[PDB]
RNA sequence: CGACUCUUAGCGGUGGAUCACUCGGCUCGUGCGUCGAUGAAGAACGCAGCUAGCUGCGAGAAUUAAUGUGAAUUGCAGGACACAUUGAUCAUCGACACUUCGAACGCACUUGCGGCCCCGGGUUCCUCCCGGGGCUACGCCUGUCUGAGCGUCGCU
RNA sequence: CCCCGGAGCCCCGCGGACGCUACGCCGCGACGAGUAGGAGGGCCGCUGCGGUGAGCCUUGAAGCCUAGGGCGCGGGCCCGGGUGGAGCCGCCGCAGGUGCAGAUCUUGGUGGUAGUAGCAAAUAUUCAAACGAGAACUUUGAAGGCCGAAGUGGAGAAGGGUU
RNA sequence: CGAAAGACUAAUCGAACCAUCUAGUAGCUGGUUCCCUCCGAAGUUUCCCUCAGGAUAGCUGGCGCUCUCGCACACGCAGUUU
RNA sequence: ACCCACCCGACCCGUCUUGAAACACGGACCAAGGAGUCUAACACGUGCGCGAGUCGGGGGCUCGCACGAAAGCCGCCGUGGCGCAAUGAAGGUGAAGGCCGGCGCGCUCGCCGGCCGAGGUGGGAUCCCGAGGCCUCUCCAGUCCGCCGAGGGCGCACCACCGGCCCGUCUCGCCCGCCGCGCCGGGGAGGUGGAGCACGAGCGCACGUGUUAGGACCCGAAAGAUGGUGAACUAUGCCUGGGC
RNA sequence: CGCGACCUCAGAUCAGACGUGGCGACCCGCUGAAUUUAAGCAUAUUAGUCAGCGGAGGAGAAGAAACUAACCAGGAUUCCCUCAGUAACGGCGAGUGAACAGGGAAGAGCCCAGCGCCGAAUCCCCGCCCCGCGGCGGGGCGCGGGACAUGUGGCGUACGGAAGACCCGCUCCCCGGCGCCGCUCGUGGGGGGCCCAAGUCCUUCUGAUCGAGGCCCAGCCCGUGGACGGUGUGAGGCCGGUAGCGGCCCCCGGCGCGCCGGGCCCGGGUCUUCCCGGAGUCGGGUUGCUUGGGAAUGCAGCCCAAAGCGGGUGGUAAACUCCAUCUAAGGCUAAAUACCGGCACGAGACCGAUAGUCAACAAGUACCGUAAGGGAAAGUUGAAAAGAACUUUGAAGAGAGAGUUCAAGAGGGCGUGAAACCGUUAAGAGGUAAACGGGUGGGGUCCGCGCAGUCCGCCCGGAGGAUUCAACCCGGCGGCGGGUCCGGCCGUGUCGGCGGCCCGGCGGAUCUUUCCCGCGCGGGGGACCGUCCCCCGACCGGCGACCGGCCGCCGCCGGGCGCAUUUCCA
């Protein structure tokens, strides 16, 4: 259960919170898991997906073991566009098909300074909890 | 329903003589809502017949002995495998029905322990059946935060939380009670009498101190004892084919004289 | 119209009463709020009784109640004078004082002096500074209790 | 058989019931309990690269600064930026800013007429002229200055 | 002059239904109009809640439609097929904004009336051409007509507000 | 307001219009939602500023209780008659 | 169950009405909506708990309430309500009687010892006792078991009647009492008013029906009241223009 | 005829301050109806209610007795429960209607004028310096102004107070700063930020899964987390969250210690001598409203108009008289209490687009009205726009093919798509309008058959074929039932232990203060009674409350038995 008497557990409230979410908050919502490989290395479950990570689509039609680079992040549409994840429209023009970030797995991160410091913060909290549990 | 609901219009009846129908009709304007039908419980817009009030007598208060009588009745039938099995609880492989346990079970701080306990005691197959029942609710309570529904599980009466109520918490189905604060809403859910519980020896000792035996007061509920029984020999089959009674009955006329 | 036997009864629902119906959906929320606020006040007045001040014993008025005895509002001045507590100080040690109480009979007076005497015996006046001057009790009766007294202080039992 | 009419069924229309959804209501509760001449509420008129409405803002006008965040915004354009840099975008909001009416204040409501001090062009204080700036409501209190009275006195 | 773990049974007292949800099951008689009105029973029906069905459901829920198959005195119900595309029901309790043909009822929709009434105030149109997919109606030219300077002309006021 | 018609006062005048008191009151019209089963009326009484309504008797239903004995072994009651 | 045929039957519903197929009203058709509710108070019935009691509110103690604004507990458990006592306008008064023996004159009156203790008549479900049968494969003896049972009893509830007691009231009477002897206080007999007593039945909770007060089954006036908006139409006055 | 004091008055765009409007759920002061009820109506009622005006605050108002009472007396205000639908009012009709006591929530008490003493000992504003400065303050210094004796400040206010003499005991309280230490209850106060568990494992459905079985180890992992939401269906483990006395960073609060700057020489009792109270107010008369308040509950106007052992109250007018009880005509005060407005949250046996707010949407919008005001309708393609390229007919709208989609029998007002009503297709009928009830017939539509439906099941007789038995013993296991209650555990009624009784506790208006402790009372012992527990023996219900042996019976497994048996099959 949730016991904190200031959170909500109220369909209408959670959905309204979700759909009318502000960009910086959507960043967090649009997170996606690391590959087991990276999960081992960084000590982090998942990361906020970003403009030019390398990525697999895990479920759907485009479900496949190819590793496409991310193309853009349409936070309004809760979606990311990926390199070869696309479909030919009526008149031949390719159109980047949206995939939801959570149905995707990050194989290669785009590491900047800030992304580096984020991963350092998440790994540290994870190991504090393991120390507290032990 | 709101006070102003339905009456926020100003609407007069065009009286008789206009054909139409003597309802109050919205006054003036160049809209669809003009010369309509206000206030009447029948009209669109309108005003529900006998709008519901807040001061409906919601709460309902019950005599204290009666409340206790119910709670004794539920306890008494938490024994009786038949009444527990009939109430659905898969209590087939459980070792003894007023199921009482060691008081390390106060100790446990992890679900891990609490589940392992339930599997040794063979009470897990109730929890298993709780998982099996988890399904979506029928209809409008879905859109009002009652979306999922399931079974009631094993009760677990404890005497003191030394950690226990944390341990049994995520195990779906389980409700934990204090002995000193029992509740008929939980001991007889659905107003239905049986329910598999799991006692802690510390708690299971305390019951007689709480409720008082037949020749001893409550000694904890000031002025109380058990309710006395109306009839003692419940098995009437043992009565009716006794020597004493069948001695004194005419022989049963049983021929069938048809027309 | 009345029909065959019944109390010819007068209800008072002729004014606009539904405009002034007062529901009680508060009450649980209220009861808690008081209770929190109560526990806070205890914690603020740290070793002082949660109760309040000590209050006198007092008989009720009228032939009806007469026989019973309650807590009164505060100890009279004569009762403080005889006990030998300066009225302005008595407030500072948790002794209720009203000054509007007469004192008719000497049976009610000596009882209420006895009360204050007893209070002063079983009271633990802390010194102003941790450095200990006169009046202020020993650090023994201080360490062994900086304890609050639950319930009414020296309760009256008829 | 013929047309037409009636009945039933199939399929198609018309129409939007039903069912299923719900970023809305309705009710009960909790905490706090804050507007204004330092110009409120309300109104007006403005402001977007393409924008009418809703919203958001005020000639610094879909916002400036700051702090937090850490790559977008995205209908299309265009762009920026080096996202190893105060740094996109959101959020917060303490600095800055805040057109005109409005208690509404120079007097009027035409958006009309003014007065008084200072500044720039205009002069070379020559007042004009133009532009900018600052004052110019009523009531009232504490003081201040100037006064009034065959009001009550004193000295001359 | 004996025992039913065996008389063999139309009566069996040694143990007892195929039957016994004892709110069950069974037998005999009698009777059955009904407004207003009253009461009982509804395994009749609607929506939500506590229980409960190791219920049902993308291998197809609800709803909808059906010259298909049935049940019930009836309220109603169950199955088949179609359509649909995401939830829904049985039982035990509790709860109610719970069942429509009518209210010159309310809101929305649709007919017959009906291709009917009707498109009749103020004399008037015709020929050719152009454009154009297309001309009774546009435009140009030609003719014939009217308003007849108290104008069907030429300019404002108010009002409109971009005409 | 009226050279007077109760005329006119924004299609409204023998008392304008708007919002509220207001869901104003109504012994009077109208309507009042599923099935089966069982029982089943009254339009007469007295009183009433009562006569298109109430009250009160009556007539109806429901709940019962107390007894009775077809369990070879009955008292009481009647829209009769003697 | 779809269509068609034929014989017989068969006027359109709703409604008010003594009477509706009516030349009585409402109704073109379909969908959705649409009217005996809730609160309070009373009464009776029924179900449950406890019972001369019962009671829960209000308050408090136990939790951040996930379920909890629940659940539990309280010398508050009873301040208090209702109930356990009436009757009188009130001052007030306030439900026991009998018997026996003795002492006062047994005076159907006054005082002292013992015994019983809510009176009696009729009817009363039911219990109880029970003469006597009625047999047993024989003549008698003879405990055991029934079945019935004439006859006789205790008699619940309830009903009818008669007694009795309490309060009010009247009438008539004769005695008692003492810190205060008094315009003091107390009793008796016989009527008569009382929503009385005569070995208790209530309290709380729940459902039902009925009756009310509330918008009170739903729809409906003509009116009434408070506070505001309009003389752009029109009525009349005035100012300033125009026209014949 | 001047100059100077003061008094009363003006004027300043004089210096510096304040007030004005809004909101209005709650609150305070006025004002104040009528529908309505009374079955009519006028008093009454509706109601001191709606509308009207005024003014506030986070609450307001009230409040420290000119009180209750009549007691063995209580002791500010507010709130709840009760008092109580009571006392009372009332065309004594309809109807209306309090208070004290009692129990709670809370709890807090104070200050002037006066009377007096103190060189006005007081206040405001200037100006210079040091600190402090986003709630203009401290300290110092100025012959720098003014207020003030027509009275400022200290002491002091009815609970008495002052001044005096000696009885006693001793001396911390406040603020302006500047630091510093412990982050100080939802279990680290408040705010902000950023963080923290476990499967996309197998197979298999599916357009997509989130669905269904599965995952040896005791049960895939995690589980203080199986709330909720999102993600192409239904997800504890995909993502955000959720749990946690979990983490880190900011900021702010609140309280603890140190230093400085100031202020501050601040008691009590005892005896004496003094001191003491709010006027056009009380009170009366009155008229009008108001109240349950009745020969006047409260408020008013007008007239009269006080006193000081007085005055007020003491619920029936007055006189006499005793008692009781307060101390009016000046003021401040947190708390429990209220809250349909606001900001910010949480929840629901509520509504689910004719509902729920007028308003799920560009709604107080469009639109109407001169104006006050009135006031709608209107949600849904799909998982994704993949929103139909291209070919062709047409001036075009419209089509026909093609394509996308799981589907366009989802085509931009597009989920589902009822009925009325219409078009057509098929079938059937047709001069008494249609339609209907009952009864048959004919035709259709499908549905069940049968390409014999002769339907099964027992038992038996015969005829074929095939496995191991049953019957019996033997060994093992399990179950039932039984009495000898045999032996022991188990418990009901009784009796014995007075044995638990102090190693058995509660309760008691039983007793005792021979006791103890604390102040005749409280607490604890100590007797006593009632109730609940140990020891063994005896009798009895030997009770479903169990064990152990023995018996009898049953069943299963395995041993035995090979075939006139016991099965299977046709
Ligand atoms: Mg509505
Ligand atoms: Mg449904
Ligand atoms: Mg208290
Ligand atoms: Mg058709
Ligand atoms: Mg619609
Ligand atoms: Mg019948
Ligand atoms: Mg009927
Ligand atoms: Mg869907
Ligand atoms: Mg409802
Ligand atoms: Mg209809
Ligand atoms: Mg024509
Ligand atoms: Mg022109
Ligand atoms: Mg009129
Ligand atoms: Mg109505
Ligand atoms: Mg009438
Ligand atoms: Mg009957
Ligand atoms: Mg009539
Ligand atoms: Mg007639
Ligand atoms: Mg008819
Ligand atoms: Mg006729
Ligand atoms: Mg009519
Ligand atoms: Mg008609
Ligand atoms: Mg309907
Ligand atoms: Mg009853
Ligand atoms: Mg009645
Ligand atoms: Mg009603
Ligand atoms: Mg009306
Ligand atoms: Mg009138
Ligand atoms: Mg104001
Ligand atoms: Mg009337
Ligand atoms: Mg009437
Ligand atoms: Mg009238
Ligand atoms: Mg009144
Ligand atoms: Mg008002
Ligand atoms: Mg105040
Ligand atoms: Mg006062
Ligand atoms: Mg009081
Ligand atoms: Mg009462
Ligand atoms: Mg009144
Ligand atoms: Mg003075
Ligand atoms: Mg989930
Ligand atoms: Mg989901
Ligand atoms: Mg996670
Ligand atoms: Mg009055
Ligand atoms: Mg008197
Ligand atoms: Mg005040
Ligand atoms: Mg809609
Ligand atoms: Mg709709
Ligand atoms: Mg709506
Ligand atoms: Mg819909
Ligand atoms: Mg739609
Ligand atoms: Mg729809
Ligand atoms: Mg489809
Ligand atoms: Mg579709
Ligand atoms: Mg559609
Ligand atoms: Mg849809
Ligand atoms: Mg045909």
From Swiss-Prot, chain A:
Keyword Ribonucleoprotein: yes
Keyword set, alphabetical order: Cytoplasm, Isopeptide bond, Phosphoprotein, Ribonucleoprotein, Ribosomal protein, Ubl conjugation
UniProt main location, coarse: cytoplasm
GO-annotated biological processes: translation
Location in the cell: Cytoplasm
N-terminal signal peptide: none
Superkingdom in the source lineage: Eukaryota
Changes after translation: Ufmylated by UFL1 in response to endoplasmic reticulum stress, promoting reticulophagy of endoplasmic reticulum sheets.
GO CC aspect terms: cytoplasm; large ribosomal subunit
One GO MF term: structural constituent of ribosome
Disulfide bond sites: none
One Pfam family, short name: KOW
Region named Disordered: 1-21
NCBIfam families: rplX_A_E
Function text: Component of the large ribosomal subunit. The ribosome is a large ribonucleoprotein complex responsible for the synthesis of proteins in the cell.
Family: Belongs to the universal ribosomal protein uL24 family.
Record text on subunit structure and interactions: Component of the large ribosomal subunit. Interacts with DHX33.
HAMAP family xref list: Ribosomal_uL24_A
The name this protein goes by in its record: Large ribosomal subunit protein uL24
Species whose genome carries this gene: Oryctolagus cuniculus
Swiss-Prot record, chain B:
Record PTM text: Citrullinated by PADI4.
Record-level Gene Ontology MF annotations: structural constituent of ribosome
Record PTM Phosphoserine, positions in chain: 237, 242
Annotated function: Component of the large ribosomal subunit. The ribosome is a large ribonucleoprotein complex responsible for the synthesis of proteins in the cell.
Species of the source: Oryctolagus cuniculus
Source organism superkingdom: Eukaryota
Main localization (coarse): cytoplasm
Gene, per the UniProt record: RPL4
N6-acetyllysine found at: 53, 206
One CC-aspect GO term: ribonucleoprotein complex
Protein name: Large ribosomal subunit protein uL4
Keywords recorded for this protein, A-Z: Acetylation, Citrullination, Cytoplasm, Isopeptide bond, Methylation, Phosphoprotein, Ribonucleoprotein, Ribosomal protein, Ubl conjugation
Residues with PTM Phosphothreonine: 213
Keyword Ubl conjugation carried by entry: yes
Residue range from the parent sequence: 54 to 312 of 413
UniProt keyword Cytoplasm, yes or no: yes
Lineage, broadest ranks: Eukaryota, Metazoa, Chordata, Craniata, Vertebrata
PTM annotation (Omega-N-methylarginine): residues: 44
Coiled-coil intervals, chain numbering: none
Complexes and interactors: Component of the large ribosomal subunit. May bind IPO9 with low affinity. Interacts with RBM3.
């Amino acid at each position: 259960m949730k016991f904190n008497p200031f959170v909500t557990s109220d369909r209408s409230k959670n959905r309204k919170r979700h759909f009318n979410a502000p960009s910086h908050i959507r960043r967090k919502i649009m997170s996606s898991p690391l590959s087991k490989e990276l999960r081992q290395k960084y000590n982090v479950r998942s990361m906020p997906i970003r403009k030019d990570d390398e990525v697999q689509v895990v479920r759907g039609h485009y479900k496949g073991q190819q590793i496409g680079k991310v193309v853009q992040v349409y936070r309004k549409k809760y979606v990311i566009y990926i390199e070869r994840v696309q479909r030919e429209k009526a008149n031949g023009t390719t159109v980047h098909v949206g995939i939801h970030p959570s149905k995707v797995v990050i194989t290669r991160l785009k590491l900047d300074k800030d992304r580096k410091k984020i991963l350092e913060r998440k790994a540290k909290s994870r190991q504090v909890g393991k120390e507290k549990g032990k | 329903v709101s006070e102003l609901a339905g009456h926020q219009t100003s609407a007069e009846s065009w009286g008789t003589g206009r054909a139409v129908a003597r309802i109050p009709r919205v006054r003036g304007g160049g809209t669809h809502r003009s010369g309509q039908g206000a206030f009447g419980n029948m009209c669109r817009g309108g005003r529900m017949f006998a709008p519901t009030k807040t001061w409906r007598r919601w709460h309902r208060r019950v005599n204290t002995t009666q409340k206790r009588y119910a709670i004794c009745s539920a306890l008494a039938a938490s024994a009786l495998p038949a009444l527990v099995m009939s109430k659905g609880h898969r209590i087939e492989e459980v070792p003894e029905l007023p199921l009482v346990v060691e008081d390390k079970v106060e100790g446990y701080k992890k679900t891990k322990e609490a589940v392992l306990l339930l599997k040794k005691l063979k009470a897990w197959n109730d929890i298993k059946k709780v998982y099996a029942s988890q399904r979506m609710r029928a209809g409008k309570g879905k859109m009002r935060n009652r979306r999922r529904i399931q079974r009631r599980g094993p009760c677990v009466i404890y005497n003191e939380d030394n950690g226990i109520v944390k341990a049994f918490r995520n195990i779906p189905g389980i409700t934990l009670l204090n002995v000193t604060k029992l509740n008929i809403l939980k001991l007889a859910p659905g107003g239905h009498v049986g329910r598999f519980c799991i006692w802690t020896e510390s708690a299971f000792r305390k019951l007689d101190d709480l409720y008082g035996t037949w020749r001893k007061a409550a000694s904890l509920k000031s002025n109380y004892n058990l309710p006395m029984h109306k009839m003692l020999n419940t098995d009437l089959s043992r009565i009716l084919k006794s020597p004493e009674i069948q001695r004194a009955l005419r022989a049963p006329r049983k021929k069938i004289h048809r027309r | 119209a009345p029909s065959r036997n019944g109390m010819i009864l007068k209800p008072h629902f002729h004014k606009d009463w539904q405009r002034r119906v007062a529901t009680w959906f508060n009450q649980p929320a209220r009861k808690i709020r008081r209770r929190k606020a109560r526990q806070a006040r205890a914690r603020r007045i740290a070793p002082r009784p949660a109760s309040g001040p000590l209050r006198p014993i007092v008989r009720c008025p009228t032939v009806r109640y007469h026989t019973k005895v309650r807590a009164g509002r505060g100890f009279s001045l004569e009762e403080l004078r005889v006990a030998g507590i300066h009225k302005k100080v008595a407030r500072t040690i948790g002794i209720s004082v009203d000054p509007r109480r007469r004192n008719k009979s000497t049976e009610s007076l000596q009882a209420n002096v006895q009360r204050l005497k007893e209070y002063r015996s079983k009271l633990v006046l802390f010194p102003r500074k941790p450095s200990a001057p006169k009046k202020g009790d020993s650090s023994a009766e201080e360490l062994k209790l900086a304890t609050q007294l639950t319930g009414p202080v020296m309760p009256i039992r008829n």
